[PDB]
Amino acid sequence: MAFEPSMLKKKQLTVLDLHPGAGKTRRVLPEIVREAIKKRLRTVILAPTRVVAAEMEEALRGLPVRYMTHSGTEIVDLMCHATFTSRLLQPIRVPNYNLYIMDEAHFTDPSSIAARGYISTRVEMGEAAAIFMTATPPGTRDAFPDSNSPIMDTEVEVPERAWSSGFDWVTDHSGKTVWFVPSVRNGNEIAACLTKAGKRVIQLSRKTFETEFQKTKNQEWDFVITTDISEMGANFKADRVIDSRRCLKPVILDGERVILAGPMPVTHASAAQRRGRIGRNPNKPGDEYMYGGGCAETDEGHAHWLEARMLLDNIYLQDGLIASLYRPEADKVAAIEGEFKLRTEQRKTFVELMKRGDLPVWLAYQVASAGITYTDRRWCFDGTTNNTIMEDSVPAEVWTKYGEKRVLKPRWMDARVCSDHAALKSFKEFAAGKR
């Protein structure tokens, strides 16, 4: 697609969907920003991560943009998706933007989903225009889209776990490989296997992305082992992508607990974004895409869209109106608008549990809605027996700040606080009352 100035008129929401590597960041985005500045539209640009934000700064070099992570007269702001949503939740002033530009608008994290819902509501009210940029917009059913250079697509058996024999083609490779895994724990086991095989490996996840991605730039490496976070703007100088074609789906069971279902097939959009990490250089043909499964569209019942409604139910708008989800995403949940609206006190705690507590949205809501205050950690230990958190098949214990050693057994079980080492470590600190 091509950008046209008429797309900036209020009530207009436009999806720009150039194929991967076609140049939406380096070419299209500055063109949009320049037009916005000329039309004196108060604008916000939304990047999925700080990595992409820094990339935009390079592309937008010389333009009066206020980077919110130098003049006072800038009318264009740039911040992260999560930063945008977080500010909407806080009782602080958010500008009445006339234009919203979201890069990587396919991002399926709750804060991004919420952002699109808020933005699309502002547009429909006639208060703004919006441009959503992504190579894989809603309705994407092509896993093998166009690329700057021909890609060698090959369906093969991809290791789901550490191996001691076979899969010679994996390690018998002299170039750089990006390997997409369904989880941190799984990637840790794959990475350990590769390291023992004498390969130089970098691991990427949401929590470690900003820091570890820097390693892909300052040293030689053979493999990058990454979760789906690398679908959201990360680029690598790689020759091969190995795609498990699998992911984990958070699912709210019984409205009492969250489990991680799967590993299960990824969406076509996800598959396309993973493959899209290579074949980006027109003058370098032959990049390989090794994939070991088909795709599936099962975002229905995915916890993230329910968590997005939890966020939007607590974002103020006008005369008690509540933002609906972005229309193509609306039927991924069944929750009623206003279902999760909290009182002022509980809402503050809700925000606090997410921000400072670093808890998943769903879990933060259970605690906050129960009227529990931030420093009250009794709930981390008083759950039913089947909520006992296990670590290497034994109950996870923690020495509390006033310890006394105690077993982790939360009143509400969200598997995401204990599915990998770093997550469990963070939750232990919280349960111990040290955050």
XYZ file of all heavy atoms in Angstrom, residues 343-380:
319
model
N -13.161 0.112 41.558
C -13.263 1.333 42.346
C -11.891 1.996 42.377
O -10.884 1.352 42.082
C -13.744 1.035 43.770
C -14.914 0.059 43.876
C -16.266 0.759 43.894
N -16.546 1.378 45.191
C -16.453 2.680 45.459
N -16.090 3.553 44.525
N -16.735 3.113 46.679
N -11.848 3.272 42.750
C -10.611 4.049 42.692
C -9.475 3.399 43.478
O -8.363 3.260 42.969
C -10.827 5.479 43.225
O -11.851 6.124 42.459
C -9.538 6.300 43.133
N -9.755 3.004 44.716
C -8.742 2.389 45.564
C -8.219 1.091 44.953
O -7.009 0.905 44.812
C -9.308 2.120 46.961
C -9.602 3.374 47.778
C -8.368 3.935 48.463
O -7.276 3.902 47.857
O -8.494 4.415 49.609
N -9.131 0.198 44.585
C -8.746 -1.099 44.045
C -8.039 -0.954 42.702
O -7.132 -1.726 42.387
C -9.970 -2.003 43.905
C -10.619 -2.349 45.235
C -11.702 -3.398 45.104
O -12.092 -3.767 43.997
N -12.188 -3.894 46.235
N -8.446 0.038 41.916
C -7.811 0.287 40.626
C -6.360 0.707 40.812
O -5.490 0.305 40.042
C -8.567 1.361 39.842
C -8.002 1.599 38.445
C -8.749 2.697 37.705
N -8.594 3.996 38.362
C -9.595 4.794 38.733
N -10.863 4.456 38.521
N -9.324 5.949 39.322
N -6.099 1.520 41.831
C -4.737 1.956 42.111
C -3.866 0.753 42.447
O -2.734 0.643 41.977
C -4.711 2.968 43.258
C -5.194 4.357 42.868
C -5.108 5.322 44.040
C -5.589 6.713 43.657
N -5.470 7.677 44.788
N -4.409 -0.152 43.255
C -3.690 -1.355 43.651
C -3.471 -2.258 42.444
O -2.404 -2.847 42.282
C -4.451 -2.128 44.742
O -4.712 -1.261 45.853
C -3.643 -3.326 45.219
N -4.494 -2.352 41.599
C -4.425 -3.127 40.368
C -3.234 -2.666 39.531
O -2.394 -3.476 39.126
C -5.745 -2.986 39.600
C -5.749 -3.630 38.244
C -5.327 -4.937 38.074
C -6.221 -2.935 37.141
C -5.350 -5.529 36.822
C -6.248 -3.522 35.891
C -5.813 -4.820 35.731
N -3.147 -1.358 39.309
C -2.056 -0.773 38.537
C -0.721 -1.027 39.228
O 0.277 -1.344 38.582
C -2.257 0.750 38.338
C -1.045 1.387 37.673
C -3.497 1.017 37.503
N -0.719 -0.891 40.548
C 0.491 -1.063 41.336
C 1.023 -2.490 41.228
O 2.228 -2.706 41.108
C 0.210 -0.706 42.797
C 1.440 -0.364 43.608
C 1.095 0.380 44.884
O -0.026 0.188 45.404
O 1.940 1.164 45.364
N 0.115 -3.460 41.265
C 0.489 -4.868 41.203
C 1.122 -5.216 39.862
O 2.012 -6.063 39.787
C -0.731 -5.757 41.451
C -1.215 -5.807 42.902
C -2.613 -6.392 42.985
C -0.254 -6.619 43.745
N 0.658 -4.557 38.806
C 1.215 -4.757 37.477
C 2.540 -4.023 37.311
O 3.517 -4.592 36.831
C 0.225 -4.287 36.410
C -1.010 -5.167 36.277
S -2.109 -4.651 34.942
C -2.697 -3.072 35.559
N 2.572 -2.758 37.711
C 3.745 -1.924 37.485
C 4.907 -2.316 38.391
O 5.945 -2.777 37.918
C 3.395 -0.450 37.693
C 4.521 0.504 37.327
C 4.036 1.943 37.211
C 3.129 2.138 36.001
N 2.795 3.571 35.773
N 4.728 -2.138 39.694
C 5.798 -2.405 40.644
C 5.879 -3.896 40.971
O 6.969 -4.442 41.142
C 5.588 -1.583 41.918
C 6.774 -1.590 42.862
C 6.888 -0.265 43.597
N 5.648 0.089 44.289
C 5.391 -0.164 45.570
N 6.280 -0.779 46.339
N 4.229 0.205 46.089
N 4.724 -4.551 41.042
C 4.666 -5.965 41.368
C 5.066 -6.860 40.209
O 5.486 -7.998 40.416
N 4.926 -6.347 38.991
C 5.316 -7.076 37.786
C 4.528 -8.379 37.633
O 5.053 -9.374 37.134
C 6.820 -7.370 37.810
C 7.401 -7.577 36.422
O 6.626 -7.815 35.471
O 8.640 -7.504 36.282
N 3.268 -8.365 38.061
C 2.401 -9.534 37.938
C 1.635 -9.496 36.620
O 1.379 -8.417 36.088
C 1.411 -9.602 39.102
C 1.980 -9.676 40.521
C 0.845 -9.738 41.525
C 2.901 -10.873 40.679
N 1.266 -10.675 36.088
C 0.384 -10.704 34.914
C -0.921 -9.958 35.181
O -1.359 -9.896 36.330
C 0.131 -12.199 34.698
C 1.296 -12.880 35.327
C 1.685 -12.028 36.496
N -1.526 -9.410 34.134
C -2.734 -8.600 34.271
C -3.843 -9.352 34.995
O -4.457 -8.820 35.919
C -3.259 -8.143 32.891
C -4.563 -7.352 33.034
C -2.207 -7.310 32.176
N -4.100 -10.584 34.570
C -5.177 -11.382 35.147
C -4.982 -11.568 36.645
O -5.904 -11.353 37.425
C -5.264 -12.748 34.464
C -6.315 -13.645 35.056
C -7.635 -13.696 34.716
C -6.130 -14.621 36.092
N -8.284 -14.642 35.473
C -7.383 -15.223 36.325
C -5.030 -15.042 36.842
C -7.564 -16.226 37.278
C -5.210 -16.038 37.788
C -6.468 -16.617 37.998
N -3.772 -11.949 37.037
C -3.463 -12.196 38.440
C -3.589 -10.918 39.257
O -4.164 -10.923 40.345
C -2.057 -12.774 38.583
C -1.614 -13.143 40.000
C -2.536 -14.194 40.600
C -0.174 -13.635 39.995
N -3.050 -9.824 38.728
C -3.141 -8.530 39.395
C -4.599 -8.156 39.645
O -4.930 -7.576 40.680
C -2.450 -7.452 38.570
N -5.472 -8.499 38.703
C -6.886 -8.172 38.839
C -7.570 -8.995 39.928
O -8.415 -8.477 40.661
C -7.626 -8.377 37.517
C -9.096 -8.074 37.650
C -9.562 -6.772 37.556
C -10.014 -9.083 37.905
C -10.902 -6.483 37.692
C -11.357 -8.805 38.043
C -11.796 -7.503 37.936
O -13.133 -7.219 38.074
N -7.221 -10.276 40.026
C -7.799 -11.142 41.052
C -7.489 -10.600 42.441
O -8.370 -10.508 43.298
C -7.272 -12.575 40.938
C -7.463 -13.235 39.584
C -8.875 -13.115 39.057
O -9.842 -13.381 39.769
N -9.001 -12.709 37.799
N -6.226 -10.241 42.652
C -5.775 -9.742 43.943
C -6.441 -8.407 44.258
O -7.032 -8.231 45.324
C -4.238 -9.579 43.973
C -3.777 -9.029 45.313
C -3.561 -10.911 43.700
N -6.352 -7.473 43.318
C -6.913 -6.141 43.505
C -8.422 -6.188 43.744
O -8.937 -5.503 44.627
C -6.597 -5.272 42.297
N -9.129 -7.001 42.965
C -10.586 -7.048 43.054
C -11.044 -7.732 44.335
O -12.196 -7.596 44.740
C -11.184 -7.772 41.844
O -10.849 -9.147 41.857
N -10.138 -8.471 44.967
C -10.434 -9.119 46.241
C -10.270 -8.147 47.406
O -10.519 -8.502 48.558
C -9.539 -10.328 46.440
N -9.849 -6.923 47.105
C -9.696 -5.898 48.123
C -8.398 -6.022 48.896
O -8.234 -5.410 49.953
N -7.473 -6.819 48.373
C -6.167 -7.000 48.997
C -5.267 -5.805 48.683
O -5.240 -5.323 47.549
C -5.503 -8.314 48.520
C -6.366 -9.510 48.935
C -4.104 -8.458 49.100
C -5.918 -10.839 48.365
N -4.549 -5.318 49.692
C -3.632 -4.196 49.508
C -2.280 -4.707 49.012
O -1.956 -5.881 49.177
C -3.440 -3.393 50.814
O -2.780 -2.153 50.527
C -2.624 -4.183 51.832
N -1.491 -3.811 48.425
C -0.263 -4.195 47.728
C 0.734 -4.977 48.590
O 1.345 -5.932 48.113
C 0.433 -2.952 47.169
C 1.700 -3.277 46.410
C 1.644 -3.826 45.138
C 2.950 -3.049 46.970
C 2.793 -4.135 44.439
C 4.110 -3.356 46.275
C 4.021 -3.898 45.011
O 5.160 -4.207 44.310
N 0.903 -4.569 49.845
C 1.907 -5.178 50.721
C 1.435 -6.465 51.399
O 2.219 -7.148 52.059
C 2.349 -4.199 51.828
O 1.207 -3.777 52.581
C 3.046 -2.987 51.235
N 0.153 -6.783 51.251
C -0.427 -7.982 51.852
C -0.172 -9.192 50.960
O -0.800 -9.339 49.911
C -1.930 -7.783 52.072
C -2.567 -8.902 52.882
O -1.906 -9.929 53.137
O -3.749 -8.751 53.260
N 0.744 -10.059 51.384
C 1.174 -11.186 50.560
C 0.672 -12.529 51.091
O 1.170 -13.582 50.691
C 2.700 -11.209 50.461
C 3.321 -9.900 49.959
C 2.983 -9.616 48.501
N 3.074 -8.191 48.180
C 4.181 -7.567 47.786
N 5.324 -8.225 47.656
N 4.146 -6.268 47.520
N -0.313 -12.497 51.982
C -0.864 -13.728 52.535
C -1.405 -14.623 51.425
O -1.303 -15.850 51.496
C -1.970 -13.419 53.546
C -1.460 -12.886 54.873
C -2.608 -12.512 55.784
N -3.425 -11.444 55.213
C -4.566 -11.011 55.739
N -5.035 -11.553 56.855
N -5.239 -10.035 55.149
N -1.954 -14.000 50.387
C -2.587 -14.738 49.300
C -1.591 -15.597 48.527
O -1.984 -16.539 47.846
C -3.294 -13.774 48.343
C -2.368 -12.873 47.587
C -1.928 -11.636 47.970
C -1.776 -13.132 46.310
N -1.095 -11.114 47.010
C -0.985 -12.012 45.982
C -1.835 -14.202 45.414
C -0.260 -11.935 44.796
C -1.116 -14.124 44.238
C -0.338 -12.998 43.939
N -0.307 -15.280 48.637
C 0.721 -16.037 47.930
C 0.925 -17.426 48.532
O 1.573 -18.279 47.923
C 2.047 -15.277 47.941
S 1.998 -13.682 47.093
